[PDB]
């Protein structure tokens, strides 16, 4: 489970300014952290299908915010991708 | 009416997760070993849910019986 001291590291990092907890970057970051953990869980435990539906939704919420962000600040998008190294 | 002696009244300020406590815990079992119904434990839906999870645990330790034998039938 991702506890507070880890979730922090991420937010504090991808925040756009001290105190920002819910900006698109911070979300896409946070989600990516969750996807990656889940995909490891599912490399063993291939049989856990209920969890796999969770992941289908997280992947979907992420490609949804990116799709928005690559329309509001397409250089701020380019940067998020690079920073994570995702969607490619 | 159907209002004879209840259990929740019989005791006091007891922990509901103390599977090691027996003299308390054994008051919630049948004449046989069976776990008592709410109508006779007088526990809330949630209280009674926790009683099982512990009475069961307490059984595995060998402190509480799983079953018994009806005397005087």
């Amino acid at each position: 489970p991702i506890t507070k001291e880890e979730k922090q590291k991420v937010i504090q990092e991808f925040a756009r300014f001290p105190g920002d907890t819910g900006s698109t970057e911070v979300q896409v970051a946070l989600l990516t952290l969750r996807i990656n953990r889940l995909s490891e869980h599912l490399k063993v435990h291939k049989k856990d299908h209920h969890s796999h539906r969770g992941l289908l939704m997280m992947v979907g919420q992420r490609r949804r915010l990116l799709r928005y962000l690559q329309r509001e600040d397409p250089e701020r998008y380019r940067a998020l991708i690079e920073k994570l190294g995702i969607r490619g | 009416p159907s209002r004879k002696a209840k259990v929740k009244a019989t005791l006091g300020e007891f922990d509901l997760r103390d599977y090691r406590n027996v003299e308390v815990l054994k008051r919630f079992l049948s004449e046989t070993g069976k776990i008592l119904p709410r109508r006779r434990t007088g526990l809330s839906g949630k209280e009674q849910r926790i009683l099982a999870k512990t009475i069961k645990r307490a059984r595995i330790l060998g402190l509480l019986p799983f079953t018994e034998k009806l005397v005087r039938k």
């Binding site: - | 799983f66 079953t67 034998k69 009806l70 005397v71 005087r72 039938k73």
Partner: protein, 119 residues
């Protein structure tokens, strides 16, 4: 020919017949009976009357080893479960206790279809 004085009587109730084992206080048999032993062919055996003489037979046979008193264990839900117990009381043996003890699984094996009912 043992002189056990005290022991146990297991009544085994059933819808088809009733059988009664008498036993030394460690559970080893002394004598027994049932509705067939009494005389009855198929189908009467289960009857309450059968169980009466069944139990009486068994106790008379056990008075021979000089039993004075027994503990009663009853298993089964059959007809004449009680008549077997009544008969052991009026048997002259001293019934020191009675205990139901019909075995039941904590959901174990699939019943035969005749005992499945529904869900």
């Amino acid at each position: 020919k043992r002189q056990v004085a005290s022991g146990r009587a297991y009544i085994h109730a059933s819808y088809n017949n009733t059988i009664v084992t008498i036993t030394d206080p460690d559970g080893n048999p002394i004598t027994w009976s049932s509705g067939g032993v009494i005389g009855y062919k198929g189908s009467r055996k289960g009857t309450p009357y059968a169980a009466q003489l069944a139990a009486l037979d068994a106790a008379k046979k056990a008075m021979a080893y000089g039993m004075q008193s027994v503990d009663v264990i009853v298993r089964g839900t059959g007809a004449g479960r009680e008549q077997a117990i009544r008969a052991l009381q009026a048997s002259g043996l001293q019934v020191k206790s009675i205990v139901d003890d019909t075995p039941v699984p904590h959901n174990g094996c699939r019943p035969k279809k005749k005992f499945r009912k529904a869900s």
